[PDB]
Design an enzyme around this catalytic site. Structure first.
Site: not given
Ligand code: CDL
Ligand code: PC1
Ligand code: PC1
Ligand code: PC1
Ligand code: PC1
Ligand code: 3PE
Ligand code: LPP
Ligand code: ADP
Lengths: 98, 230, 187, 125, 72, 114
Positions: A53-55, A57-58
């Site tokens: 989970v990218d920042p 996408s979070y």
């Protein structure tokens, strides 16, 4: 009816919602995301970066989690979360009506 | 999960059958007064007279499409078609055809044609013009390419449903991004631009005329891949 | 979020900062915090206006969120001290202002929301509190003395001093029988 | 519209967070005072900001001569200062109507010759 | 639907989720005496009630009931 | 018995991937699941109740709890005033005020009424 004797607040378990169900629903929501590749690798102790989970996408996943769980999560709490364990713990212990 | 069976006085699907009018469920049984039951039971409809009437006096199978590939008749002996509109074109044609029946009929029938016109004017200017009429004016019924002229013939619906074709040079066609026109014509796209594609708008620079293509319109792979259009 | 935008006499700039980022002083935030909070706010507002709105169009919603996501990815890639990033921030702050809706829906799970404090929850102190002995038994000796302290009566709930002198039954016998007996024995 | 940065002359508490006050006026009691012991004689520790607000107004004072006119709004201050004069002038203008008509006028009427309301007037043998 | 129930201190005389076992007899002994009081008030007030004439009745101007002007 | 069965350090979904497995059709599979089939009957309070009753008319909800079983329904309680029911002081403030009320009422009745 309540007994005439004095009764105190009964904090049975800090969780106001079934933590197992909360964790499973959150993991399913995370797996729904495109960046997430292997749902099996996701555990409560797995960090967002390692599960993929990218920042950015979070925040999307957390907005959909708010919609799913019928609650609003503050930016401070979302930034304090570091693992799925912390996320599910906060959600389960949250009183949905604040 | 269902526990209705544990109680003798609990509601049943036989009790819920009355909701099938307001609720969509797959059919379970046929009532005596259904159209299907009546037709299959009454021997009158089995008569060859009624059968032949059904076979003849109704929509024909000839007009029914038979394939996913359509090759409409060529507009010119040397041209090839590229784009064609199926349903929105017919709908616009039938709507604009009302001007040939309702309007003269309104004039000859209404006691106060001036009142009708005074009501229609503001109705046209708000919620009708931008809703249908401008979209129809800019709507592309059909598009073909004439290679000898290196031109494109575009068919359009006019007043009273009249169809007219016009030629535009391929060198004068440009792509107009939707961002450049959304603010200018917000109302048009707000209430009437849904049928046509927003991101596939073209215009003729010389004549300043737009081309709207139906979302549910058929395109030709060969026509798109022809070198003239690429 | 405390959802107190329309209370406490916030200025427009402060309200805009609260809406875009959780804080009223975005300067304290770092680059990642600023970008992520602005992206979350933009997505929340777009969802409010194009999903839970008036005759919402889901295809338009998808296109809009996709464009916003691409733009915010570019913003995050950009360096903090860039005029392009400043322009992006101004653009999306303007979008937030444009979509600002008075009487916007505030979730009931947030502070200062409608129905936020309709009920007063009683603490264990109040639950235990029972100066009289009807519900919680009351010792005749008001309290339990602790070591290293004298034994004193608890202060009564009602401290009215409108008290008569001690009352005794009519024809109460109060002769000093002990003294009389000792004197009789002494003779 | 009122904001702390731009109020200028309409004073108000600043929105910025501040540290609690170290020294502030507090409740004080007369020597050898009898304590108030209602409802079990339970006293909670007072909040410094709340106590400061309680005792701030009583001790507030003007720093320099003439500050009262400028503080707040000069027009409203002058109107408040002249209010008694306005009331007196309105009363006199109203009494002009009474004089010209014949209605009640602003005077100490003396219909009773010193006879008080429902007084007992008697003599003794 | 409603809010979750929470404990209420016993010592505090408050109405949160108060239900009385003897509510039937309480209602019986609170309704009828109130009805009797209102009946007494009603019969007391009816002495000073005014109604206009009926359908077939007219007020004679010279009858005592007819309004009379002050005689100086 | 308030301990919670929560699984940590172990996966909860057994699907290797969302695309390869038709999750959109068959959903997610569960692993290490604490299955508990709960067959609690809603409307149990309604079972065998007359139509004209509080339960049916107003409280005919899914999981309504009866007063006899609800542990947080309160019966009348609390102290009317701050006076101690069992007080050994010969206090007379209440008697004085009651006497004032009674004498005022008696004076009105016997001197003024009528
Ligand atoms: C005697 C003859 C009478 C009959 C003739 C006709 C009437 C003529 C009357 C005179 C009108 C012109 C002169 C007034 C100038 C303004 C007052 C002044 O000088 O004080 C300094 C003036 C005010 O300082 P400040 O009050 O400390 O400033 C506060 C800040 O602005 C911060 O403000 P804030 O954001 O905190 O908001 C507060 C604001 C708003 O406050 C509120 O909302 C609370 C309510 C405030 C009062 C509002 C008026 C209510 C009605 C009053 C009735 C009075 C009756 C008793 C007196 C009767 C006298 C006959 O407070 C104010 O109102 C301040 C503005 C100035 C006062 C305006 C209201 C009173 C003016 C006098 C009216 C007299 C009427 C007489 C006739 C009555 C009918 C018979 O300072 C400035 O110059 C700064 C700008 C202020 C705004 C000016 C707006 C334009 C005014 C006209 C300019 C051109 C004048 C040309 C004159 C030429 C020679 C005569
Ligand atoms: C101050 C000034 C005020 C002025 C106000 C003016 C108000 C009056 C406006 C008059 C409008 C006239 C419209 C003409 C319509 C035709 C235009 C045209 O060329 O279209 C050809 C169009 C298209 O022609 P085409 O060549 O493309 O194709 C032929 C038709 N199709 C498409 C089917 C193949 O053809 C028609 O629509 C033919 C219509 C024929 C019938 C017209 C009259 C119908 C109404 C009759 C009276 C009312 C009913 C009475 C019933 C009595 C029962 C007993
Ligand atoms: C003279 C210049 C040309 C004028 C062209 C006529 C106006 C434009 C075309 C109008 C087509 C719609 C006609 C609908 C007729 C409905 C029945 C009727 O009342 O006719 C007699 C009446 C008039 O006949 P009248 O004049 O004998 O009626 C007596 C007079 N009144 C009614 C005022 C007491 O029709 C109308 O009032 C029409 C008003 C103009 C409508 C303009 C478009 C707005 C409506 C959109 C179309 C759908 C409307 C559906 C209405 C359904 C019923 C509420
Ligand atoms: C928002 C609505 C506001 C409405 C207006 C509110 C009131 C405004 C002020 C009214 C002033 C009225 C002045 C005239 C009355 C004088 C009374 C008097 O006799 O006093 C003498 C007094 C002494 O009175 P005295 O009590 O010694 O009199 C002797 C006793 N008697 C009378 C009984 C015999 O002398 C003065 O000191 C007067 C000084 C006057 C200074 C100049 C005032 C000018 C006011 C102008 C106002 C604007 C014009 C009018 C606007 C309205 C038009 C409709
Ligand atoms: C001789 C003729 C008849 C004589 C009768 C004279 C009656 C005189 C008036 C009596 C008023 C009694 C008020 C009792 C209030 C009890 C507390 C309560 O309700 O809960 C408070 C609630 C909650 O109370 P609580 O639940 O915390 O505590 C209840 C129990 N106690 C108080 C003992 C601890 O608190 C509030 O929010 C305050 C609400 C006050 C609402 C008052 C409404 C009065 C409306 C009366 C309308 C009458 C119309 C008259 C028309 C004719 C006029 C001429
Ligand atoms: C025209 C067609 C109209 C159609 C209407 C259709 C319905 C409309 C919508 C509903 C509105 C009314 C709802 C009333 C619900 C009543 C429910 C009920 O009566 O339940 C029985 C209950 C028994 O008590 P219990 O079960 O212990 O209560 C706790 C339950 N949890 O309680 C009872 O038994 C009720 C009686 C209790 C005891 C009463 C004692 C007397 C009270 C004073 C009566 C005064 C009468 C005065 C008459 C004057 C005549 C001149
Ligand atoms: C006083 C006028 C009273 C009303 C008269 C109505 C006449 C209707 C017949 C019109 C025939 C010619 C159409 C020409 C189209 C064209 O190419 O029109 C092209 C013109 C000129 O181009 P631009 O104005 O866009 O630059 O466009 C116009 O907008 C002006 C003409 C408007 C004609 C509108 C006709 C439809 C009216 C609908 C009324 C409301 C709905 C009624 C129920 C269905
Ligand atoms: N005494 C006060 N004086 C001036 N402004 C105040 C005061 N109390 C609150 N404000 C306003 O309340 C807002 C802060 O609300 P608060 O309940 O303190 O939560 P937080 O400080 O965490 O943001 C600020 O706009 C602040 O200006």
């Amino acid at each position: 009816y309540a007994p005439q004797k004095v009764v105190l607040r009964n904090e049975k378990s800090g969780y106001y919602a079934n933590p197992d169900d909360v964790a499973r629903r959150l993991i399913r929501l995370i797996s729904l995301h495109d960046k997430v590749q292997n749902p099996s690798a996701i555990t409560l102790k797995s960090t967002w970066s390692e599960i993929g989970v990218d920042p950015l996408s979070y925040v999307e996943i957390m907005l959909e989690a708010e919609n799913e769980f019928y609650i609003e999560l503050a930016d401070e709490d979302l930034e304090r979360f570091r693992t799925v364990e912390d996320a599910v713990e906060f959600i389960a212990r949250n009183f949905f009506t604040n | 999960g269902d526990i209705r069976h544990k109680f003798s006085n609990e509601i049943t699907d036989d009790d819920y059958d009355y909701q099938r009018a307001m609720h969509v469920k797959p059919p379970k049984e046929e009532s005596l007064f259904q159209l299907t039951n009546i037709l299959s039971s009454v021997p009158v409809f089995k008569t060859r007279f009624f059968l032949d009437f059904i076979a003849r006096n109704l929509d024909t199978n000839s007009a029914v499409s038979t394939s996913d590939f359509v090759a409409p008749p060529r507009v010119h002996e040397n041209s090839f078609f590229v784009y064609h509109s199926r349903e929105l074109g017919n709908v616009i044609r039938k709507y604009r055809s009302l001007e040939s029946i309702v309007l003269p009929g309104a004039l000859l029938t209404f006691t106060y044609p001036l009142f009708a016109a005074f009501v229609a004017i503001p109705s046209y200017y708000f919620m009708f013009n931008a809703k249908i009429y401008e979209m129809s004016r800019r709507f592309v019924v059909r598009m073909d390419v004439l290679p000898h002229l290196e031109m494109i013939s575009v068919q359009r619906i006019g007043a009273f449903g009249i169809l007219y074709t016009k030629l535009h040079r391929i060198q004068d066609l440009e792509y107009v991004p939707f961002d450049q026109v959304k603010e200018q014509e917000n109302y048009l796209w707000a209430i009437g631009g849904h049928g046509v594609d927003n991101q596939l708008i073209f215009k003729d620079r010389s004549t300043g005329e737009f081309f709207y293509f139906e979302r549910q319109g058929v395109w030709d792979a060969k026509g798109l891949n022809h070198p003239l259009l690429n | 979020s405390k959802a107190y935008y329309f209370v406490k006499n916030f200025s427009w700039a402060e309200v805009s900062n609260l809406l875009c980022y959780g804080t009223k002083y975005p300067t304290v935030l770092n680059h990642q915090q600023k970008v992520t909070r602005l992206y979350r706010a933009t997505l929340r507002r777009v969802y409010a206006h194009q999903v839970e709105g008036y005759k919402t169009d889901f295809k338009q919603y998808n296109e809009n969120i996709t464009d916003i996501g691409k733009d915010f990815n570019k913003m995050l890639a950009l360096k903090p001290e860039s005029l392009e990033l400043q322009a992006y921030f101004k653009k999306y702050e303007d979008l937030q202002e444009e979509l600002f809706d008075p009487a916007m829906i505030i979730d009931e799970s947030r502070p200062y929301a409608a129905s936020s404090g309709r009920y007063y929850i009683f603490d264990d102190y109040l639950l235990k509190f029972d100066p009289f002995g009807f519900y919680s038994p009351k010792l005749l000796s008001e309290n339990r003395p602790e070591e290293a302290m004298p034994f004193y009566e608890d202060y009564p709930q009602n401290d009215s001093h409108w008290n008569l002198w001690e009352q005794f039954p009519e024809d109460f016998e109060d002769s000093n029988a002990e003294r009389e007996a000792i004197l009789k024995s002494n003779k | 519209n009122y904001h702390y940065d731009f109020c200028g002359r309409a004073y108000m508490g600043n929105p910025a967070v501040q540290s609690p006050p170290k020294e502030f006026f507090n409740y004080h009691y007369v020597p050898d005072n009898y304590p108030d012991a209602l409802s079990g004689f339970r006293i909670a520790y007072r909040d410094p900001f709340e106590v400061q607000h309680v005792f701030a107004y009583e001790n507030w004072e003007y720093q320099y001569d003439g500050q009262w006119w400028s503080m707040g709004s000069l027009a409203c201050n002058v109107l408040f200062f002249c209010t008694p004069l306005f009331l007196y002038l309105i009363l006199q203008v109203e009494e002009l109507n009474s004089e010209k008509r014949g209605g009640t006028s602003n005077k100490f009427y003396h219909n009773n010759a010193g006879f008080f309301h429902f007084q007992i007037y008697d003599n003794k043998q | 639907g409603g809010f979750q129930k929470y404990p209420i201190p016993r010592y505090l005389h408050v109405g949160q989720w108060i239900v009385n076992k003897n509510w039937k007899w309480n209602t019986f002994h609170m309704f009828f005496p109130t009805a009797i009081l209102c009946f007494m008030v009603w019969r007391n007030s009816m002495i000073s009630t005014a109604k206009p004439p009926n359908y077939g009745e007219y007020v004679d101007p010279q009858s005592p009931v007819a309004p009379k002007a002050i005689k100086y | 018995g308030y301990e919670v069965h929560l699984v940590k350090d172990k996966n909860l979904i057994g699907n290797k991937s969302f695309k390869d497995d038709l999750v959109a059709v068959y959903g997610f599979t569960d692993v290490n699941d604490h299955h508990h089939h709960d067959e609690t009957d809603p409307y149990h309070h309604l079972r065998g109740v007359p139509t004209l009753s509080f339960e049916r008319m107003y409280f005919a909800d899914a999981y309504y709890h009866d007063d006899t079983h609800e542990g947080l329904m309160n019966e009348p309680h609390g102290y009317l005033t701050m006076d101690d029911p069992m007080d050994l002081r010969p206090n007379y403030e209440k008697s004085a005020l009651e006497l004032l009320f009674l004498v005022s009422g008696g004076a009105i009745l016997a001197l003024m009424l009528g």
